[PDB]
Amino acid sequence: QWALEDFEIGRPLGKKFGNVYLAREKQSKFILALKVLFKAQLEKAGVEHQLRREVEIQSHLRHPNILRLYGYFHDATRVYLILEYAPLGTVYRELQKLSKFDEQRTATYITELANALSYCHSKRVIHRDIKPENLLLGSAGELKIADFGWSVHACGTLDYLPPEMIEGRMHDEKVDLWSLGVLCYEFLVGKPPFEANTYQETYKRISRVEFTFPDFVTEGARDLISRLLKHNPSQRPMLREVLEHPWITANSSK
Ligand SMILES: O=[S+](=O)Oc1cccc(-c2c[nH]c3ncnc(N4CCOCC4)c23)c1
C-alpha cells in the first residue's frame, strides 16, 4: 500500500539504525517523517523481529503526547517507517540550547509525559527508553514520546535505565517511573543524575542510587525526584500521585 514513489523526500531530520528525513505524501501533500532502515543493520544486529514487534505496538497507539506511526513498508534493501512530523524538534536539542529548564517547563513536560505513559501502561505497554532525544515537540510545544524500539508488554548509555534492569532482575511498569525521575532531574539540572565518564561508574552510581542535588533545586522538586528515584520499584509512587504532586500541580501548565 506504500512505496517511495508515493513520497517526495526533503530535509534530513537526523540520526546507525538509519536516517530520518522530512517528506511529503504526494497525493495528500501531507508532510511527515520518513525513517530509512537498511536491512543490513537489521541482519547484523538481529533486529529483524523487534521492528515487526514495535511497528504493531505503536501503529495502533493513539495519544496526543505520543508520536503517531501511520504505517510502514519495505523495498529490496531498506525498510521505511512513516512517522508524525514534530515541527519543534527534540527536547534534547531544546535542553542543549537552554542548558536548564524552569519549573513550569519541567513540570509541564513531566505532566505530558505521565499522561502518555499511563495510556501506554493501560495497554500494558512499557517504554523503558524515555530519553531527551526520544522526546519530540509538536507545533504547540506539545511533548511527544517517540521511538518504541525496546517497547514490550511484560547496550548504550545506561543513564536512564533503572537498577532492576541493569542488574538483570524482573522489570515491571515501575521502570518508566524511574526514567521519569531521571528526566525531571536532567530537565532541571541539565545533566542526568547518574552521569559518569564510565559505563562501569554509571552502573554503580545507578545501582546504589547515588545522586546529589545542586543548590538551585526546589525542595518541591527534590521531593518528587527522590521519590521516583528509589531502588525498590514497589516504593516508586503511582503515575496518578505524580500528576497530583504539589510541585507538579503548582508549576505545571493547564
Ligand atoms: O527510532 S525511529 O523512530 O527514528 C526516530 C527517533 C526519534 C524521533 C524521530 C522523529 C519523528 N518525527 C520527527 N520530526 C523531526 N525530527 C525527528 N528527529 C529528531 C532528530 O533526529 C532524528 C529524528 C523526528 C524518529
Curated annotation (Swiss-Prot):
Instruction: Establish whether keyword Cell wall biogenesis/degradation is in the entry.
Output: no
Q: Which residues form the active site?
A: 129
Q: Which post-translational modifications are recorded for this protein?
A: Phosphorylation at Ser-207 decreases the kinase activity.
Covalent cross-link site, Glycyl lysine isopeptide (Lys-Gly) (interchain with G-Cter in SUMO2): 131
Query: Which tissues is it found in, per the record?
Result: Highly expressed in testis and weakly in skeletal muscle, thymus and spleen. Also highly expressed in colon, ovarian, prostate, neuroblastoma, breast and cervical cancer cell lines.
Enzyme Commission no = 2.7.11.1
Catalyzed chemical reaction(s): L-seryl-[protein] + ATP = O-phospho-L-seryl-[protein] + ADP + H(+); L-threonyl-[protein] + ATP = O-phospho-L-threonyl-[protein] + ADP + H(+)
Q: What is the effect of changing residue 28 to R?
A: In a colorectal adenocarcinoma sample; somatic mutation; reduces interaction with TPX2
Outline the extent of the Protein kinase domain.
7-248
The processes (GO biological process) annotated in the record are: anterior/posterior axis specification; apoptotic process; cell division; centrosome localization; cilium disassembly; G2/M transition of mitotic cell cycle; liver regeneration; mitotic cell cycle
Reported effect, residue 200 to A: Reduces binding to MYCN
List ligand-binding residues for ATP: 16, 35, 84-86, 133-134, 147
Q: The organism sits in which domain of life?
A: Eukaryota
For this UniProt entry, the molecular function terms from Gene Ontology, in alphabetical order, are: ATP binding; histone H3S10 kinase activity; molecular function activator activity; protein heterodimerization activity; protein kinase activity; protein kinase binding; protein serine kinase activity; protein serine/threonine kinase activity
Q: Name what induces it.
A: Expression is cell-cycle regulated, low in G1/S, accumulates during G2/M, and decreases rapidly after.
Residues with the modification Phosphoserine, per the entry, are: 207
The UniProt entry's GO CC annotations, sorted and at most eight, read: axon hillock; basolateral plasma membrane; centriole; centrosome; chromosome passenger complex; ciliary basal body; cytosol; germinal vesicle
Keywords per UniProt:
ATP-binding, Cell cycle, Cell division, Cell membrane, Cell projection, Cilium, Cilium biogenesis/degradation, Cytoplasm, Cytoskeleton, Isopeptide bond, Kinase, Membrane, Microtubule, Mitosis, Nucleotide-binding, Phosphoprotein, Proto-oncogene, Serine/threonine-protein kinase, Transferase, Ubl conjugation
Mutating residue 211 to A: effect?
Answer: Decreases the interaction with phosphatase type 1 isoforms
UniProt subunit comment: Part of a complex composed of NEDD9, AURKA and CTTN; within the complex NEDD9 acts as a scaffold protein and is required for complex formation. Identified in a complex with AUNIP and NIN. Interacts with FBXL7. Interacts with CPEB1, JTB, TACC1, TPX2, PPP2CA, as well as with the protein phosphatase type 1 (PP1) isoforms PPP1CA, PPP1CB and PPP1CC. Also interacts with its substrates ARHGEF2, BORA, KIF2A, PARD3, and p53/TP53. Interaction with BORA promotes phosphorylation of PLK1. Interacts with CIMAP3. Interacts with GADD45A, competing with its oligomerization.
Instruction: Tell me the function of this protein.
Output: Mitotic serine/threonine kinase that contributes to the regulation of cell cycle progression. Associates with the centrosome and the spindle microtubules during mitosis and plays a critical role in various mitotic events including the establishment of mitotic spindle, centrosome duplication, centrosome separation as well as maturation, chromosomal alignment, spindle assembly checkpoint, and cytokinesis. Required for normal spindle positioning during mitosis and for the localization of NUMA1 and DCTN1 to the cell cortex during metaphase. Required for initial activation of CDK1 at centrosomes.
Family statement: Belongs to the protein kinase superfamily. Ser/Thr protein kinase family. Aurora subfamily.
Note, other: Centrosome amplification can occur when the cycles are uncoupled, and this amplification is associated with cancer and with an increase in the levels of chromosomal instability.
**Identification of the protein by name:** Aurora kinase A
Species of origin reads Homo sapiens (Human)
In the UniProt record, the gene name given for this protein reads AURKA
The stretch of the full-length protein covered here is 127 to 389 of 403
